[PDB]
Enzyme design. Structure first.
Site, mmCIF file in Angstrom:
data_model
loop_
_atom_site.group_PDB
_atom_site.id
_atom_site.type_symbol
_atom_site.label_atom_id
_atom_site.label_comp_id
_atom_site.label_asym_id
_atom_site.label_seq_id
_atom_site.Cartn_x
_atom_site.Cartn_y
_atom_site.Cartn_z
ATOM 1 N N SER A 1 4.869 -7.179 -1.691
ATOM 2 C CA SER A 1 4.563 -7.269 -0.266
ATOM 3 C C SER A 1 4.977 -8.640 0.246
ATOM 4 O O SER A 1 4.568 -9.660 -0.318
ATOM 5 C CB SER A 1 3.069 -7.025 -0.013
ATOM 6 N N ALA A 2 5.767 -8.655 1.325
ATOM 7 C CA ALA A 2 6.416 -9.888 1.773
ATOM 8 C C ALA A 2 5.419 -10.894 2.341
ATOM 9 O O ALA A 2 5.594 -12.109 2.172
ATOM 10 C CB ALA A 2 7.492 -9.565 2.808
ATOM 11 N N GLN B 1 0.810 -10.147 -6.359
ATOM 12 C CA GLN B 1 0.365 -11.503 -6.638
ATOM 13 C C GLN B 1 1.341 -12.269 -7.515
ATOM 14 O O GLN B 1 1.123 -13.453 -7.764
ATOM 15 C CB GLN B 1 -1.018 -11.482 -7.292
ATOM 16 N N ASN C 1 -5.617 -10.314 -7.693
ATOM 17 C CA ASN C 1 -5.731 -10.991 -6.412
ATOM 18 C C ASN C 1 -7.038 -11.756 -6.264
ATOM 19 O O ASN C 1 -7.109 -12.674 -5.437
ATOM 20 C CB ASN C 1 -5.595 -9.984 -5.262
ATOM 21 N N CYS D 1 -19.200 -11.125 -12.807
ATOM 22 C CA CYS D 1 -20.430 -10.771 -13.487
ATOM 23 C C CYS D 1 -20.816 -11.910 -14.418
ATOM 24 O O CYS D 1 -20.005 -12.784 -14.744
ATOM 25 C CB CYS D 1 -20.258 -9.448 -14.251
ATOM 26 N N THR E 1 13.479 4.411 10.329
ATOM 27 C CA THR E 1 14.372 3.339 10.763
ATOM 28 C C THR E 1 14.008 2.021 10.094
ATOM 29 O O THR E 1 12.830 1.696 9.921
ATOM 30 C CB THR E 1 14.333 3.183 12.288
ATOM 31 N N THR F 1 0.830 -1.200 0.000
ATOM 32 C CA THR F 1 0.000 0.000 0.000
ATOM 33 C C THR F 1 0.866 1.251 0.000
ATOM 34 O O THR F 1 0.611 2.193 -0.765
ATOM 35 C CB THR F 1 -0.933 -0.002 1.213
HETATM 36 C C1 LIG Z 1 12.481 12.417 18.272
HETATM 37 C C2 LIG Z 1 12.463 11.358 17.173
HETATM 38 N N1 LIG Z 1 11.472 11.377 16.256
HETATM 39 C C3 LIG Z 1 11.443 10.446 15.273
HETATM 40 C C4 LIG Z 1 12.427 9.466 15.204
HETATM 41 C C5 LIG Z 1 12.397 8.420 14.091
HETATM 42 O O1 LIG Z 1 11.673 7.294 14.505
HETATM 43 P P1 LIG Z 1 11.301 6.173 13.346
HETATM 44 O O2 LIG Z 1 10.379 5.096 13.891
HETATM 45 O O3 LIG Z 1 12.595 5.561 12.869
HETATM 46 O O4 LIG Z 1 10.639 6.880 12.178
HETATM 47 C C6 LIG Z 1 13.428 9.440 16.120
HETATM 48 C C7 LIG Z 1 14.510 8.355 16.002
HETATM 49 N N2 LIG Z 1 15.776 8.993 15.640
HETATM 50 C C8 LIG Z 1 16.930 8.391 16.186
HETATM 51 C C9 LIG Z 1 17.531 7.550 15.119
HETATM 52 S S1 LIG Z 1 17.061 8.140 13.459
HETATM 53 C C10 LIG Z 1 18.016 9.034 16.994
HETATM 54 O O5 LIG Z 1 19.232 8.745 16.808
HETATM 55 O O6 LIG Z 1 17.748 9.892 17.882
HETATM 56 C C11 LIG Z 1 13.452 10.384 17.112
HETATM 57 O O7 LIG Z 1 14.467 10.393 18.079
#
Ligand SMILES: Cc1ncc(COP(=O)(O)O)c(CN[C@@H](CS)C(=O)O)c1O
Lengths: 385, 388
Positions: free
Chosen positions: A202-203, A182, A154, A327, A240, A73
């Protein structure tokens, strides 16, 4: 009574080997790969191996990009909204072509793009449950920005002629994205042989974990990020890394190509057994040609009975299946037929979708045949026709 | 690596074995799609409801509120910013967003792209205490401000922002208030109705949950154009098949985080203070930000002769995992040299060492880190031809 899962086109079981490959990357190996210390870098070889397995599984080349997303998605939203942003809101284009049978992640996104002034043609589907390349050619204008057609459906398992559509798209110099969810694990996937510019997958549909998907981009072609931020995924998709998700996805993709190359005929044989046995019931119709159908999919329309009632009775019998819109139409020399149709169409009745996997056993198929015949008889005895 | 020690918990955290155990069945044993109608799909439904309930209970959200499960806090930030731009700017009468210079890149880079779309953005700089105060927000709000996005607590300094006061000022102005609350869960009390925020982003891998799952809290199910369109997952606000293991683990981890909150206020804080006082025993060392407004698990220390990246590499060779933080030089009110937070983009910024604890830090880890830190500082100052 036995529980039997035949809804594999909706989601799949995680291969125990995939879960085993994933296990270390929760508590034993938890560092952030973007860290410089040994805790973060410990998972790096697993990430390279996973990306290599993905590239090898879909036949992408080294110049190509494979961005890991959260789900298909996300990949479809990204392709559609990014090409809209790049070539339509800041370009000279205003047209996107797709089919009436796409996944909601494509259809609703296209409808929102329509709400933004984008002209979209939702191509109807032929008797075979597919969209042909010449219709695409006829609908391409000089302002068409992107053609987005799913690789395989699908609901019916029908395989689309993605290579021919790619040839037409290259002749007109228009970009081509396909929803290939698919396709992975069910048909050979070669993205340079298919000539696609973008591909979604999609895994959790080829026995990987839920929560991780991917978008293939030929030659790193420009595509404005859906998620901005850090320089994850070559600066194309921040957030991340789902390290367990990536490792499991790579392992599942490798296993899917391995079982496609050797055990294609076991799954195909079980599907064909089930479909022939079910078609032994009078006034039952399998939707779509089998010689153009994924090896795991059946969509059967039963006469007098309603698809949801058939699913409820099967579920009471321990058999999990799903729905598919179809149909009624005529043939040319065997008139009564059931054909694929958009779910929105007013001509649509509901048929029963049965989708196998490499984990389906022949005992499950025997039980499913017997219980299917029992349910057909039972619900037709109570039917209004 | 004489002893392996993880002090980069502000970057990511280890999955609590209980969280991983709670997730385990939902890969191979329970694999149906929750949107399916058959028993295979619906088997996981009570676990999903329990996980969502744990989330609502953990942040003090109400039943009218919405908590949409995302893939990561980056998704939540992109969603909030681009959605309010779509709702109030491209199809409204607004054109201004207020934020800080110290946000996570998922906010900063998104704001830069929105500027590339014509949005007015003011990146509010940070004070000596490493925070943005509410009266400055009030001064920058016009009748065209669409949204104020200020992080709850800083990931480099651990400084806690006055999100409640900022919310009160935003409510006076009738402007929406979003907070990036990733650093808050498990480290400080989180009550989203007491904070008065309209949006909150959080990420499970920060409070010992799995990577690949996040959340966005929405105060009244306030309208917000979907970032992901498609099926009607999460009440039609974020489509895509549910990350069932991720959701279960996130709920369990958030419940554990609220339970361990007092442990982190007391014991983890005691260990952090031990490490920080021991490090501050070294001459010409400066801790960035006041501790009385800092999360219990964070230190951002500046060393004078030593260079931050070399210091991190030298710590890693000793088996100690840490990170960086941007700092600037200033004086206090008594005209005493201190180090203060600054945006990483500033040319006044040098690199400081960030040490972040968790509920799993041991006192041996702290003692070993003290010793190796003092050794590395002496070694790197011993080779300098300039240090005085
Ligand atoms: C305040 C804040 N807001 C968003 C994120 C990112 O989270 P995610 O789930 O990866 O999207 C982080 C994570 N930042 C990390 C590694 S990028 C740090 O080294 O501080 C964060 O600290």
């Amino acid at each position: 009574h036995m529980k039997v899962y035949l809804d594999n086109n909706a989601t799949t079981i995680v291969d125990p080997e995939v879960k085993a490959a994933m296990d270390p990357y929760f508590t034993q190996i938890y560092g952030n790969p973007n860290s410089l210390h040994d805790f973060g870098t410990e998972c790096h070889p697993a990430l390279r191996k996973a990306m290599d397995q993905m590239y090898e599984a879909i036949g992408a080349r080294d110049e190509d990009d494979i961005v890991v997303t959260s789900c298909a998605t996300e990949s479809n939203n990204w392709v559609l909204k990014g090409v809209y942003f790049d070539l339509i809101k800041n370009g000279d284009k205003d047209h996107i072509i797709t089919t009436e049978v796409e996944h909601p992640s494509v259809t609703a996104t296209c409808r929102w793009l329509e709400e933004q002034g984008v002209r979209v043609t939702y191509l109807p589907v032929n008797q075979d449950g597919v969209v042909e390349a010449h219709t695409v050619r006829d609908f391409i204008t000089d302002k068409t920005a992107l053609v987005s057609i799913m690789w395989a459906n699908n609901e019916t398992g029908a395989i689309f002629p993605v290579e021919e559509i790619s040839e037409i798209c290259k002749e007109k110099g228009v970009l081509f994205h396909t929803d290939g969810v698919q396709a992975i694990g069910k048909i050979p996937v070669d993205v340079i042989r298919a000539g696609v510019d973008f591909m979604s997958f999609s895994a959790h549909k080829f026995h990987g974990p839920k929560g991780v998907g991917g978008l293939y981009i030929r030659n790193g072609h420009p595509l404005t990020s859906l998620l901005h931020g850090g320089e994850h995924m070559g600066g194309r998709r921040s957030g991340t890394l789902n390290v367990p998700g990536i490792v499991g996805m790579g392992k599942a993709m490798e296993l899917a190509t391995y079982y496609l190359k050797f055990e294609e005929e076991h799954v195909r044989k079980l599907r064909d057994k089930l479909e022939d046995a079910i078609l032994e019931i009078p006034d039952t119709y399998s939707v779509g040609p089998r010689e153009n159908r994924t090896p795991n999919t059946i969509l059967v329309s039963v006469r007098g009975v309603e698809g949801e009632a058939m699913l409820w009775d099967l579920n009471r019998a321990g058999i999990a299946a799903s729905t598919g819109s179809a149909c009624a139409s005529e043939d040319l020399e065997a008139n009564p037929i059931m054909v694929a149709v958009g779910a929105d169409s007013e001509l649509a009745h509901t048929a029963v979708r049965l989708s196998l996997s490499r984990f389906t056993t022949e005992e499950e198929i025997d039980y499913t045949i017997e219980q299917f015949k029992k349910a057909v008889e039972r619900l037709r005895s109570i039917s209004s026709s």
